[PDB]
């Protein structure tokens, strides 16, 4: 369905409709509306910069070069993508989320250096 | 090394800490704080648009096709990347930065036209 309609659907089904949520990320009420608009812009840009430093700018489904550690979650693909929803998954991996982000950043840095060196191999 | 920790460091060493300094770039008192936040957002967006028109969107280390002109700095790669800091370099070539940026835009325009023709050759 429309905005957040796939929230109760499986991860491999909700992931088919990512643009629907993506398009919805953008005196008493004068200053409050202005603060809300600046807050929405700031949160969107922080997410876009965070995707940028990972090398995922301009993509909604971005594959990376960070291997999955079985300590974060040891469930197989038939239990995550076919028998789980995104909210359940967010609860499952919340504690380790920042760790994953750090590794992603580090991975991009190495792949940013290596690619530069190849462009220098005359 | 945290935010700006590499400021006095070697350019070849400071070039590994780009992420730390990129993540930190983003009634009367409410108006003042909103002006500061909107100004920060506009400066970030101008830098991102400037990277975009150069064809460097989503990257921190972007190689280009514009050759370096000895007039800007007749210094060998060791004197820049091994001995100098980014502040000294920024002072050294400030006079020419508005020239350099312009050349970058032109090269990307040519590149885009080139890409367009290849996608049609078929």
């Amino acid at each position, epitope marked *: 369905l429309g905005f957040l309609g796939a929230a109760g659907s499986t991860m491999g089904a909700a992931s088919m409709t990512l643009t629907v949520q993506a398009r919805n990320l953008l005196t008493v009420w004068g200053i409050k509306q202005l603060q809300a608009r600046v807050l929405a812009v700031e949160r969107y840009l922080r997410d876009q910069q965070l995707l940028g430093i990972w090398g995922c700018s301009g993509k909604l489904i971005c594959c990376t070069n960070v291997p999955w550690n079985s300590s974060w979650s040891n469930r197989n693909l038939s239990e995550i993508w076919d028998n789980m929803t995104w909210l359940q998954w967010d609860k499952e991996i919340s504690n380790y989320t920042q760790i994953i982000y750090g590794l992603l950043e580090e991975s991009q840095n*190495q792949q940013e*250096k*290596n690619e*530069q*060196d190849l*462009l*220098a191999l*005359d | 090394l945290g935010f700006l920790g590499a400021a006095g460091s070697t350019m070849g060493a400071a070039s590994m800490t780009l992420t730390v300094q990129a993540r930190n770039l983003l009634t009367v008192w409410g108006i003042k704080q909103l002006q500061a936040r909107v100004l920060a957002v506009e400066r970030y967006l101008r830098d991102q648009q400037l990277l975009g028109i150069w064809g460097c969107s989503g990257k921190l280390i972007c190689c280009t096709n514009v050759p370096w002109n000895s007039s800007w700095s007749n210094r060998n790669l*060791s004197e820049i990347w091994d001995n100098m800091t980014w502040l000294q370099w920024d002072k050294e070539i400030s006079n020419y930065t508005q020239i350099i940026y312009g050349l970058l835009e032109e090269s990307q325009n040519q590149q885009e036209k080139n890409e367009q023709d290849l996608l049609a050759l078929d």
Partner: antibody
Amino acid sequence: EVQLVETGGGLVQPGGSLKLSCRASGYTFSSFAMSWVRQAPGKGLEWVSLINDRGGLTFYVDSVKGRFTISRDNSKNTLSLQMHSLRDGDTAVYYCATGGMSSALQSSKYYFDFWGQGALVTVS
Amino acid sequence: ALTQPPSVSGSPGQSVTISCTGTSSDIGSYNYVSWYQQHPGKAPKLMIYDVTQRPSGVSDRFSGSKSGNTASLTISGLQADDEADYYCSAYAGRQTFYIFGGGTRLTVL
């Protein structure tokens, strides 16, 4: 007074595997790219493989892409080469060499500078 | 592979040249034609890198040149210490990184 010392066994059966090590001293190990070059007993020098200074990029000759792995550990000043299947045509003296590529922030090399003593790999 | 003569010779006091010929995709396009001197029973050593330069600690006698698709190493003096096999190495771009030629026997009379 740069030193490069290769270690590793010199006698292998056909179809087996062999690990060579190579310790460096006298310079900053992590600042230079490294390579392996081989010389058959009756032939000249033939390049085997190259690895970047940081250890991430590896390059090989066409004949060895699926058989040889080059690696380094900058914290132990060690260059390693793991050879699988190691056919009879690979019998040679294997030399370590410093150089062959740069980090794009350093001047170009495209040459092999310091040369190691060498280790002889004989395929039975 | 690069082509070199099997043998070059001369007496002390004269200069000699060692030729190295390749193709347009290696010798011509890329001006990185290094030369190595291998003493028998020992490991090689660098004598001239790039196409004309020389490392510190190597005598002025060794010099290099390149014209067209032919590179050349010129050795003057011939003090009879250089009883060695000479090799030319050429960068050949990506996927084919370096190509070495056959050894050249330098004999001092």
